[PDB]
A = this chain, B = another copy of it.
């Protein structure tokens, strides 16, 4: 509630349906908590700042607070550790969540309210755990005590937990003890635990009664214990004699609701089937970064996982061993519900069709990861049986053509699963990611029996070929093709002619052949592509073009950034003025970073009629004309950021009748016209931040136009706060226009003592 604030430099978000008020003071360099904080707020954000300590009077009048964040308030360049006065949190009866990460605390704070449900104490100096200060946390549910003693934040003392310290926490559900130098599992954990995170510790042995009472556990993590330290870019200590993490056969017996089990980087050598005897509902299993190269050939334990969804076996290669072929056990056919399989780091020479026979009967298999394996010989025709597969990974391996602040400072989710990189080519269907491979020329015979491929990635292969319309012949149903970081010779206009169903084409980073001058550059090759929608050819350094115009009856998006359009539009050269005129359906243009010092008169007349998104960022426009914008009758998102413009148009209404997203970020504008926004009711977005503007007059910024503006930025510039802008001073602190960084970035240059003064916090009584 309270809606209208007074001088708070933090953003305020209101949710009437959820009855939640959010105050975000992230990255504000506040030495102390500002005054005037509303009593109706619920979430308080107090991240990285210069707060010396916490006083009980800080939250004296705040009783509706349910979330307090204090993450990374002092990262070890920082003063002494934060001190918490006694009874500093007892007044918050409605508190439910509290974050105290990165505060260099020595002991667990006391006096916490009994209504607390979440507590985070990561990146602290708490290496001792006793029941006395845990008695007050009898109603807690989620506890985060990780990252207290490890290589980044050392304490030189092993973690000490007294007996039955967590036993009385009946409401505990999630416990995290990662990177805490823990040696022994803290028995006895409460029976209501669901997620246990003991990874990245120094645990060497597991007792048979360690998880005897945990029956509702769902997520168990035991990574980093006795890890594989070979070629490790971080300080890790192998266990002795290379010994593996000793886990008894009858260890996971009481676990019946377990769903996620992570054993990554444990130096394991054998996986007994007795482990998975009781856990029948296991879904995700991680066994990466181990020494299970021989176990994969046997994989006897896979017979007890009928409901497995994810299986990770990455980076299990043997030292000084180069396998001739991948040895997949026949027990892999028992994974009926398997969906994702990763066999990276299993470096081997040749991949054959019969080696993937166990995976032929997996109906639910979607993702098959095989990258980073240095596969030399691989017949691509063997993938014709994997039509149901969604993503096939053929990454940095060497397949060739066939011959004849800290972590806790952000990410409030804390313990979260590894989110897979969702590439733009996955949504189009079947994907064959052949990027960064040893393919140097394309043959139509290699891609045979692959008519079902809806996507193909060939970035980084460094292919030097002159396509003429016969290489991608079998790829009849291909819709997305990536050809970035290659050497494409556009000597013929029939390139990509046989790709009848192609929609998105990427030929970026092909600067090699485009940099040469005098050779033919057929830029009209898009005419044959009937259903092409997006074309990305940026960072190509295109300086000359044999074709006068580019023709495409369906192209909608064209990226032409990082090229040389100044030479194409050189003074006295009108050949390439109407280069984009024939693109009838084009709606978005990205001609940026083209070293365009000036725009010759006539380019706007040659622009496509349906242009809607024009960008000219980082171009260095010394003088950009404005009267020529009348030709574009559909422009709505003109962008001129990071340019060297110096004059705004006399009347924006006379220039464009549909512009609504004007952007002039990081420009050099000292003053605006006296009728800059006169009768321009169609505008909704305006940006003038990072400029050299001095003052704004009333006649240039009418309130009628400003009422409908969704966003307006005037921060990080050189405004002068004298008695000549009393109207601006009154309006900036009395309007509802969303102006971000109104009290943190925009300051006053002068005069004199007014250096660094907040404009919204200005009151010139003598004016």
Convert A311-323 into 0s and 1s, putting 1 for each residue whose CB lies closer than 8 angstroms to a CB of B: 0000000001111
Chain B residues contacting A405 (CB-CB under 8 Å) are none
Q: Does A401 contact B (CB under 8 A)?
A: yes
Q: Does A398 contact B (CB under 8 A)?
A: yes
Q: Which of A320-348 contact B (CB under 8 A)?
A: 320-324, 347-348
Convert A223-250 into 0s and 1s, putting 1 for each residue whose CB lies closer than 8 angstroms to a CB of B: 0000000111111000000000000000
Cα distance A322–B347 in the bound complex, in angstroms: 24
Chain B residues contacting A438 (CB-CB under 8 Å) are 374, 398, 438
Q: Does A158 contact B (CB under 8 A)?
A: no
Q: Does A519 contact B (CB under 8 A)?
A: yes
Contacts A374-B440, A518-B151 known; A323 to B404 CB distance under 8 Å? Answer: yes
Q: Does A513 contact B (CB under 8 A)?
A: yes
Q: Does A403 contact B (CB under 8 A)?
A: yes
- What is the minimal beta-carbon distance from A236 to any residue of chain B, in angstroms? 9
| Contact between chains at A376 and B400 (CB < 8 Å) | yes
Q: Does A393 contact B (CB under 8 A)?
A: no
Q: Does A26 contact B (CB under 8 A)?
A: no
- In the complex, the chain B residue whose C-beta lies closest to that of A513 is B233
Q: Does A93 contact B (CB under 8 A)?
A: no
Q: Does A466 contact B (CB under 8 A)?
A: yes
Chain B residues contacting A401 (CB-CB under 8 Å) are 322
| Contact between chains at A466 and B324 (CB < 8 Å) | no
- What is the minimal beta-carbon distance from A444 to any residue of chain B, in angstroms? 9
| Contact between chains at A231 and B374 (CB < 8 Å) | no
| Contact between chains at B519 and A233 (CB < 8 Å) | yes
| Contact between chains at B322 and A403 (CB < 8 Å) | yes
| Contact between chains at B233 and A404 (CB < 8 Å) | no
Option from B323, B402, B466, B519 in Cβ contact (under 8 Å) with A235: B519
| Contact between chains at B519 and A403 (CB < 8 Å) | no
Q: Does A464 contact B (CB under 8 A)?
A: yes
Q: Does A451 contact B (CB under 8 A)?
A: no
Chain B residues contacting A441 (CB-CB under 8 Å) are 320, 322
Q: Which of A283-327 contact B (CB under 8 A)?
A: 320-324
| Contact between chains at B230 and A466 (CB < 8 Å) | yes
Contacts A374-B440, A440-B374, A443-B320 known; A235 to B400 CB distance under 8 Å? Answer: no
| Contact between chains at B404 and A322 (CB < 8 Å) | yes
Chain B residues contacting A101 (CB-CB under 8 Å) are none
- What is the minimal beta-carbon distance from A398 to any residue of chain B, in angstroms? 6
Cα distance A404–B230 in the bound complex, in angstroms: 21
Q: Does A179 contact B (CB under 8 A)?
A: no
| Contact between chains at B403 and A466 (CB < 8 Å) | no
Chain B residues contacting A464 (CB-CB under 8 Å) are 231
- What is the minimal beta-carbon distance from A391 to any residue of chain B, in angstroms? 25
Q: Does A349 contact B (CB under 8 A)?
A: yes
| Contact between chains at A376 and B374 (CB < 8 Å) | no
Cα distance A403–B326 in the bound complex, in angstroms: 12
Chain B residues contacting A516 (CB-CB under 8 Å) are 233-234
Q: Does A506 contact B (CB under 8 A)?
A: no
Q: Does A489 contact B (CB under 8 A)?
A: yes
Q: Which of A339-383 contact B (CB under 8 A)?
A: 347-349, 374, 376-377
| Contact between chains at A323 and B403 (CB < 8 Å) | yes
- What is the minimal beta-carbon distance from A471 to any residue of chain B, in angstroms? 9
Chain B residues contacting A233 (CB-CB under 8 Å) are 512-513, 516, 519
Chain B residues contacting A466 (CB-CB under 8 Å) are 230-231
Cα distance A320–B403 in the bound complex, in angstroms: 10
Contacts A320-B441, A441-B320 known; A234 to B519 CB distance under 8 Å? Answer: yes
Chain B residues contacting A320 (CB-CB under 8 Å) are 441, 443
Chain B residues contacting A518 (CB-CB under 8 Å) are 151, 234-235
Chain B residues contacting A403 (CB-CB under 8 Å) are 322-324, 348-349
- What is the minimal beta-carbon distance from A739 to any residue of chain B, in angstroms? 41
- What is the minimal beta-carbon distance from A229 to any residue of chain B, in angstroms? 9
Q: Which of A396-423 contact B (CB under 8 A)?
A: 398, 400-404
Q: Which of A432-451 contact B (CB under 8 A)?
A: 438, 440-441, 443
Chain B residues contacting A324 (CB-CB under 8 Å) are 403-404
Chain B residues contacting A234 (CB-CB under 8 Å) are 516, 518-519
Most chain B CB within a 10 A radius of its CB, from A349, A402, A443, A513: A349
Q: Which of A496-551 contact B (CB under 8 A)?
A: 512-513, 516, 518-519
Cα distance A398–B376 in the bound complex, in angstroms: 9
Cα distance A519–B348 in the bound complex, in angstroms: 29
Chain B residues contacting A377 (CB-CB under 8 Å) are 376
- What is the minimal beta-carbon distance from A125 to any residue of chain B, in angstroms? 18
- What is the minimal beta-carbon distance from A674 to any residue of chain B, in angstroms? 44
Cα distance A441–B403 in the bound complex, in angstroms: 26
- In the complex, the chain B residue whose C-beta lies closest to that of A319 is B441
Convert A464-489 into 0s and 1s, putting 1 for each residue whose CB lies closer than 8 angstroms to a CB of B: 11100000000000000000000001
Chain B residues contacting A349 (CB-CB under 8 Å) are 400, 403
Cα distance A234–B518 in the bound complex, in angstroms: 7
Chain B residues contacting A374 (CB-CB under 8 Å) are 400, 438, 440
Cα distance A443–B232 in the bound complex, in angstroms: 20
- What is the minimal beta-carbon distance from A351 to any residue of chain B, in angstroms? 13
| Contact between chains at A321 and B404 (CB < 8 Å) | yes
Cα distance A124–B137 in the bound complex, in angstroms: 92
Cα distance A443–B319 in the bound complex, in angstroms: 10
Chain B residues contacting A512 (CB-CB under 8 Å) are 233
Chain B residues contacting A402 (CB-CB under 8 Å) are 322
- What is the minimal beta-carbon distance from A519 to any residue of chain B, in angstroms? 5
Cα distance A467–B529 in the bound complex, in angstroms: 54
Convert A190-217 into 0s and 1s, putting 1 for each residue whose CB lies closer than 8 angstroms to a CB of B: 0000000000000000000000000000
Chain B residues contacting A465 (CB-CB under 8 Å) are 231
Cα distance A519–B377 in the bound complex, in angstroms: 37
Cα distance A349–B440 in the bound complex, in angstroms: 13
Most chain B CB within a 10 A radius of its CB, from A235, A403, A466: A403
Cα distance A133–B195 in the bound complex, in angstroms: 97
- In the complex, the chain B residue whose C-beta lies closest to that of A151 is B518
Chain B residues contacting A231 (CB-CB under 8 Å) are 464-466, 489
| Contact between chains at A400 and B398 (CB < 8 Å) | yes
Cα distance A169–B466 in the bound complex, in angstroms: 47
- What is the minimal beta-carbon distance from A280 to any residue of chain B, in angstroms? 37
Chain B residues contacting A347 (CB-CB under 8 Å) are 440
Cα distance A466–B229 in the bound complex, in angstroms: 11
- In the complex, the chain B residue whose C-beta lies closest to that of A441 is B320
- What is the minimal beta-carbon distance from A623 to any residue of chain B, in angstroms? 25
Cα distance A230–B492 in the bound complex, in angstroms: 12
- What is the minimal beta-carbon distance from A619 to any residue of chain B, in angstroms? 25
Chain B residues contacting A323 (CB-CB under 8 Å) are 403-404
Convert A40-65 into 0s and 1s, putting 1 for each residue whose CB lies closer than 8 angstroms to a CB of B: 00000000000000000000000000
Cα distance A489–B231 in the bound complex, in angstroms: 7
Of the A-B pairs whose beta carbons lie under 8 Å apart in the complex, a sample of 7, sorted by A's number, is A232-B519, A233-B512, A234-B518, A322-B400, A322-B404, A324-B404, A348-B403
Across the A-B interface, give the 5 residue pairs with the lowest CB-CB distance, nearest first.
Answer: A235-B518, A322-B403, A349-B403, A233-B516, A324-B403
Given contact pairs A231-B464, A320-B441, enumerate 6 new A-B contacts (beta carbons under 8 Å).
A321-B404, A324-B403, A348-B403, A349-B400, A376-B398, A398-B400
